[PDB]
Subunit: 116 residues, 4 copies
């Protein structure tokens, strides 16, 4: 898995389930082009977004739709989403795990980058 | 001061000084319109971005230039920048804080009523 | 003010008010000796814990009573308290910040030189 | 695994490997009694600390020896360790994952609690 996203809920002490995630890649004309999307599973993880072949060098944006997540649990949160923007694969293929820990008025995000 | 931004450095345990911050407001065509900008002070804070008159309800984006901060320190970072996107609601002062590490950041909003 | 403690609430986006904070200093027999205490203010801050004369080099523990904070709000929390343990070094002011959620907390130290 | 500890390094974007972890349980006389210990693996995880039978109700303290970790990487960090203190199994057996994200002058800790 070259790109995996994991989301946790710091209010419940649980995976954040059914969180929508949209990935974009910056195009030549500097616009954000849709690249992949999905939703987190019961484990809070989203696998299978892309492949080694498709996940070329570029600048990527992972959008985690946190506001929709919170509202469905009865909470009106601060952020619209959590964005994670990074250059990927510029020194060759890597595996990326993007983690996000969510609270209504805060989030943390961490990346683990490993060489296959 | 309806909007203040504070940035901290978790590698050195210090304010993050001279960090560029850009604020955008979402326009009717869904594009991001430049709204305000500046650089953090020696206290890691950025004051005077906007005014009560000007800071109307809407969706705002605060972009914090973290990559350039780390690059100047000779540290290799993960993110291009940190982004904080939120809706301003009438019914208060917003403090957006960001705690920076090379491969992680934490952001928090403190919303208080005068 | 050589030591200040700030506590924030990530569920409500506010200062964490009236949080009990206890500071201990490690004694020669390795036990924790009560050193200072108080409750956070309406700004979530606790000032005046100690003085320059009294805050000598040594290992200190700051205990933040998070469980009681959440219980009063009717929210079920994970931790008994948050603990911040560190060595004071001569060669500055310490700000210990804690950002609280029911099953998580983040703590940060800002160490600055007058 | 009723109790697992996971540690990540926010400077390197990697698991925190070979981090010593000491677990204590509060005794009847309110002293901290040694309960289990170990070190994180190449994945940043520490498994096998205890068993369902041994991990009874109580107040537990997980000490993560962060200072020793940082010093060996050339960094003089702020904290002596990261402590995580919690009541466990007071409503029956649960599985606990304690995660810690480390920086030299900060850390985050999160617990995921699941019912078998």
């Amino acid at each position: 898995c070259p790109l995996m996203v994991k989301v946790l809920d710091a209010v419940r002490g649980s995976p954040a389930i059914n969180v929508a995630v949209h990935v974009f890649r910056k195009a030549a004309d500097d616009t954000w082009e849709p690249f992949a999307s999905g939703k987190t599973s019961e484990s809070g993880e989203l696998h299978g977004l892309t492949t080694e072949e498709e996940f070329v060098e570029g600048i990527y944006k992972v959008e985690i739709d946190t506001k929709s997540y919170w509202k469905a649990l009865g909470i009106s949160p601060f952020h619209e989403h959590a964005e994670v923007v990074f250059t990927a694969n510029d020194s060759g293929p890597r595996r990326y795990t993007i983690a996000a820990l969510l609270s209504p008025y805060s989030y943390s995000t961490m990346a683990v980058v490993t060489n296959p």
